[PDB]
Amino acid sequence: QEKPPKELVNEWSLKIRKEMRVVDRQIRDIQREEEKVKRSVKDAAKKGQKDVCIVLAKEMIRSRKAVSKLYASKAHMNSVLMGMKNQLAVLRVAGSLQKSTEVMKAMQSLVKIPEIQATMRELSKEMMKAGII
C-alpha cells in the first residue's frame, strides 16, 4: 500500500488550525461592523428617529449572536485540536490511532452549514477511516 502514516493528524491539525484563522477573521469583521452600527444607533437616537434605533438594535443583537455562534464553533475546533494532540500522545507510545467520543461530537456539532464547512464533512470522513470516528 502507500498510505500516509498517522501524520494524518498533523494534516488535520493544519486544516482545523486554518479554519480557526477563518473564524477569527469573521469575528473580527463582525466586531468591526458593530462599531459602525453603534455610531449609527447613537445619531439615530440623538435625532429622535425611534424607529431607526429600534431596527439598528435588532441588527446589533443579530451581530452579537453571530459572534456567539462563532466563538462556539472555535471552542469545538479547539476541542478537535486537543483531541489530535491526544492522538499524537496515544501514538507516541502505541503508534496507532484509536476512537474518540470527544473528537466525534465536536466534529458533529461542527459540520454545520453557514461557511465552507463542507470540508468538515470530509475531515469527518477521513477520520473514521483512520479509526477515530
From Swiss-Prot:
Q: Which protein is depicted?
A: Charged multivesicular body protein 3
**Ranges for region Intramolecular interaction with C-terminus:** 1-106
Q: Changing residue 52 to E does what?
A: Abolishes dimerization
Q: How does it sit in the membrane?
A: Lipid-anchor
Transcription regulation as a keyword?
Answer: no
Origin: domain of life: Eukaryota
Example of a GO biological process term: plasma membrane repair
List, alphabetically, the GO terms of the cellular component aspect: amphisome membrane; autophagosome membrane; cytoplasmic vesicle; cytosol; early endosome; ESCRT III complex; extracellular exosome; kinetochore
Notes on the domains: The acidic C-terminus and the basic N-termminus are thought to render the protein in a closed, soluble and inactive conformation through an autoinhibitory intramolecular interaction. The open and active conformation, which enables membrane binding and oligomerization, is achieved by interaction with other cellular binding partners, probably including other ESCRT components.
Q: Which residues form a coiled coil?
A: 15-47
Q: What is its main location?
A: cytoplasm
Assembly description: Probable core component of the endosomal sorting required for transport complex III (ESCRT-III). ESCRT-III components are thought to multimerize to form a flat lattice on the perimeter membrane of the endosome. Several assembly forms of ESCRT-III may exist that interact and act sequentially. Forms a metastable monomer in solution; its core structure (without part of the putative autoinhibitory C-terminal acidic region) oligomerizes into a flat lattice via two different dimerization interfaces.
Provide the tissue specificity. Answer: Widely expressed. Expressed in heart, brain, placenta, lung, liver, skeletal muscle, kidney and pancreas.
Segments for region (Important for autoinhibitory function): 52-57
**Result when mutating residue 55 to D:** Abolishes interaction with CHMP2A and assembly into helical tubes in vitro
The signal peptide stretch is none
The UniProt site entry described as Important for autoinhibitory function is assigned to: 41
Q: What is the effect of changing residue 21 to S?
A: Impairs HIV-1 release
The cellular location(s) given in this protein's UniProt record come to: Cytoplasm, Cytosol; Membrane; Endosome; Late endosome membrane
Q: Does the keyword RNA-binding apply?
A: no
